[PDB]
Amino acid sequence: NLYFQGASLTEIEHLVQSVCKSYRETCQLRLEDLLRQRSNIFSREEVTGYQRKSMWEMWERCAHHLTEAIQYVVEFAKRLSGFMELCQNDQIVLLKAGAMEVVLVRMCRAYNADNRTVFFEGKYGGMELFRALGCSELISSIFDFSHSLSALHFSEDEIALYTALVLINAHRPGLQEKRKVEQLQYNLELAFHHHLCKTHRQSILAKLPPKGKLRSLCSQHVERLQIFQHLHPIVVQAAFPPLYKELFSGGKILHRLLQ
Ligand SMILES: C=C(C)[C@@H]1CC[C@]2(C(=O)O)CC[C@]3(C)[C@H](CC[C@@H]4[C@@]5(C)CC[C@H](O)C(C)(C)[C@@H]5CC[C@]43C)[C@@H]12
């Protein structure tokens, strides 16, 4: 929109409010409900039930909860200034490469660093809950990532502006209108940095996760998905969500959602 060109301070400050609004309207669960349900945690019997579940059933349940989270990320993008003004090829390029990374950041709200548990299917559970997945190295890496993010003590507004920058990334391979994405990213970084300056919160800039860790977590996920697909190809074909397979398994629901 406007933010495909240079922006004044006043336009930057209103971009802050716009992004913070779009995130408030499109976050799956409210922070207050997540924090308040930390007292209810899975029993040792319930954890065993999850661990004794079959691998392909666990993978399918997790793929559906992941797809649900992606759907709110897509709606977040559609409410972001300039995203719908972009061409549809670039919209799909940004979502295909960022929607998972955004979910990985949003996840720190559902994570409790006090006991290293995460809110999953109604209760809080540690990473042993997912032992039936057979990717304990990836699970551990994601729990560590949420742990380091929780150390930053994000506000909701900070998560809003950070995840906006995760999505609007002009370096994604395949962008057709790169410079126009470059300007949108530039204005969104001013909005982010303006908010941190105003709230005396710039010290977190040097504490943010490095660029290659969100990309590395996403690669590990595609890595483990291909290993699961080789072991259970009909499960993926018959029971995985279409949006999930479009994003992480090559071969169009994004087209529909974007319109
Ligand atoms: C089985 C697969 C499709 C994924 C492959 C391994 C995996 C990965 O993505 O790396 C390991 C992390 C998990 C288990 C994903 C599946 C989605 C979930 C989920 C967002 C679901 C909704 C929940 O409320 C909560 C926010 C707590 C989790 C956080 C943990 C991950 C990201 C799996």
Curated annotation (Swiss-Prot):
Compartments it resides in: Nucleus
Effect noted on mutating F120Q: Completely abolishes transcriptional activity
Tissues of expression: Isoform 1 is widely expressed in many tissues, including liver and adipose, and highly expressed in skeletal muscle. Isoform 2 is primarily expressed in immature thymocytes.
Residues spanned by motif AF-2: 243-248
UniProt-reported outcome of changing A69F: Completely abolishes transcriptional activity
Domain NR LBD: 11-249
Stated induction or repression of this protein's expression: Up-regulated in the state of obesity.
Function, in words: Nuclear receptor that binds DNA as a monomer to ROR response elements (RORE) containing a single core motif half-site 5'-AGGTCA-3' preceded by a short A-T-rich sequence. Key regulator of cellular differentiation, immunity, peripheral circadian rhythm as well as lipid, steroid, xenobiotics and glucose metabolism. Considered to have intrinsic transcriptional activity, have some natural ligands like oxysterols that act as agonists (25-hydroxycholesterol) or inverse agonists (7-oxygenated sterols), enhancing or repressing the transcriptional activity, respectively.
Entry comment, domain topic: The AF-2 (activation function-2) motif is required for recruiting coregulators containing LXXLL motifs such as NCOA1 and NCOA2.
Family, similarity comment: Belongs to the nuclear hormone receptor family. NR1 subfamily.
Subunit text: Interacts (via AF-2 motif) with the coactivator NCOA2 (via LXXLL motif). Interacts with the corepressor NCOR1. Interacts with CRY1. Interacts (via AF-2 motif) with the coactivators NCOA1 and PPARGC1A (via LXXLL motif). Interacts (via AF-2 motif) with PROX1. Interacts with FOXP3. Interacts with NR0B2.
Disease implication from the record: Immunodeficiency 42: An autosomal recessive primary immunodeficiency characterized by increased susceptibility to concomitant candidiasis and mycobacteriosis. Candidiasis is characterized by persistent and/or recurrent infections of the skin, nails and mucous membranes caused by organisms of the genus Candida. Mycobacteriosis is characterized by infections caused by moderately virulent mycobacterial species, such as Bacillus Calmette-Guerin (BCG) vaccine, environmental non-tuberculous mycobacteria, and by the more virulent Mycobacterium tuberculosis.
Protein name: Nuclear receptor ROR-gamma
Gene from which the chain derives: RORC
